[model samples]
Target chain A: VEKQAAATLNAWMRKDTEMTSEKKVAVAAGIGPATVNRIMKAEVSTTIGVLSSLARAFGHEAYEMIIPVGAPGIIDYDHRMYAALPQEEKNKITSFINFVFEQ
Target chain B: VEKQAAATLNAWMRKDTEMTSEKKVAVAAGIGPATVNRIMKAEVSTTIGVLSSLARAFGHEAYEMIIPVGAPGIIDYDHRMYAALPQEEKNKITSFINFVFEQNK
Candidate 1:
């Protein structure tokens, strides 16, 4: 999980050179910029949901990016619902690890 | 999600009604007591985690409450971690659908 999360973080950095350090912090925390820096530098382990939120700020599809291959098959209804979601809502959904887990 | 949430809601109602209709809406929303009753009568579908949270309010463990009989098994680490959690933290974990899907997803 740590490697995957680090890779995703690196991907975000690569995709958006415009992201300021301040933004990275907020992205890390899944909150506003003020909260971002503290979270990034803090020793506390961040939740997957927070990482997903950070990925969203970079305009990436966090859930698809983070899903481990052959992990498990979601129900067809969920797949359909996921596909039907507008991009913005999908982005919103990926911001929390819990949402990703529960979906 | 709706049917499951409703059954869970019914269970909660049976367990506690100091939970007014108002509390039902909030419980349905995975919010405060004020939000439970509105959620119960609304046609909107509630998330599984929210139902789980409501079940917690009734002294039930939400994840255990709604897991399908043969759903995919979670990672061993997760199961171990779940077993280690204080009951309160465990309850807080079951308030949103996203948490459930990400685990299974």
Candidate 2:
């Protein structure tokens, strides 16, 4: 799963001139360079702030990094926004969302 | 206190993880021990350097050091990083940890 996240990061770094280098991404994200390196390599799992930094740096939505084709609003999945709530709360919200949407 | 450590440290500790003694660990981590103690007891956010030192003391890779419950805009959920995981993957992690948590307990 993290590997896919890494793949998305790699794609963004290469495709976007603004964040062309790992160093650049690190600077853009306002985090340590190794963080940019490790996340891109999937050597480590990342944080909500870290990923949001990366997304903003590359001019993409935070969900785009993980969800592909962007985070689906139909389910109201916004990881950057959602991951912050308590775990049980997220489950509650998801359950509610799925119930409403699935219907 | 829990809220501060929630951001500053991983907060969830293992029996063998060696965090009870702050001064001793500060030496091991090459920083002030109370900063370590302060973070755990006070649940305060300290410098990245302090946390980074603790992370190194504990052998955490950089981002591994700052795994908090939430901050904003980072969705890197590897802080606990469950967010990147699908339900099935999340389930596997839960199961693995349950066994691990049980063993430790």
Candidate 3:
């Protein structure tokens, strides 16, 4: 999905020499003006479904993103540890979880 | 993932130039000999996850297949009707449900 989104974005940028935010939203995303504004403002995380939709609009097959090497795996260790710890010890593990979970 | 699989198959067929069933299974699918034989014998349906793995092994991004038009949509009416029907009258709708959910769980 990420690859498709990236490809779509690349295509849109190439097509529209001007490449305004509004044009990007309409042509690349196929979303409403309000949705585009909200996305630009960082109100929500970019969804896979939205990316899939964009890829479809751009005449490209939507490709699922590959898992990066050194990326965090399935089990969330820090979350489990934090939940296991006592309330007083929780703060100490909060930073630990953030560090471990962060890219 | 269908496009990636198709691409990978195209590549493998070109590379080998023979296109034998055994080679097709190994290079195109990345599965063991026994597994390939089983698949050739029509033991199992091709799984999406397996396709994803094949795509990854070929250094291509796994593309999700689009829902084809003329394909049945969600909320299957025949299934609902079959489940709603009386047991004696159920046989009449059996072929109908069979038509709708063929090869589907």
**Cα lDDT, all candidates:** 0.40, 0.49, 0.39
- The DockQ scores of all candidates, in the order shown, are 0.04, 0.06, 0.05
Residue-wise lDDT of candidate 1 within A1-103, one digit each (tens)?
2234344444455546554565644644456536444333433334434534555455443333333333322211233244244455555543543343443
Interface C-alpha root-mean-square deviation, candidates in order: 14.9, 13.3, 20.3
Quality class of the docking in candidate 3, CAPRI style: incorrect
What digit string (tens of lDDT, one per residue) describes model 3 on residues B51-83? 546645644323322222222221112222223
lDDT of 3 at B2: 24
**Clash list (residue pairs), candidate 3:** A1-A63, A1-A64, B1-B63, B1-B64
Which regions in candidate 2 have their CA more than 4 angstroms from the true location? A68-103, B1-105
TM-score of 2: 0.35
Candidate 3, superposed: residue stretches over 4 Å from native: A1-12, A16-21, A33-43, A64-103, B1-105
Residue runs of model 1 more than 4 Å from their true location after superposition: A17-44, A48-56, A69-103, B1-105
Q: Return whichever of 2 and 3 wins on TM-score.
A: 2
- Where is model 1 chain B poorest over a 10-residue stretch in terms of lDDT? B68-77
Cα lDDT tens digits, model 2, B1-105, are 113333445344443455566434336557654564564554443433444455546544233443333544332333222333355444443343323121222
- Superior by lDDT: candidate 1 or candidate 2: 2
Q: Is the docking of candidate 2 incorrect, acceptable, medium or high quality?
A: incorrect
Highest TM-score, which number? 2
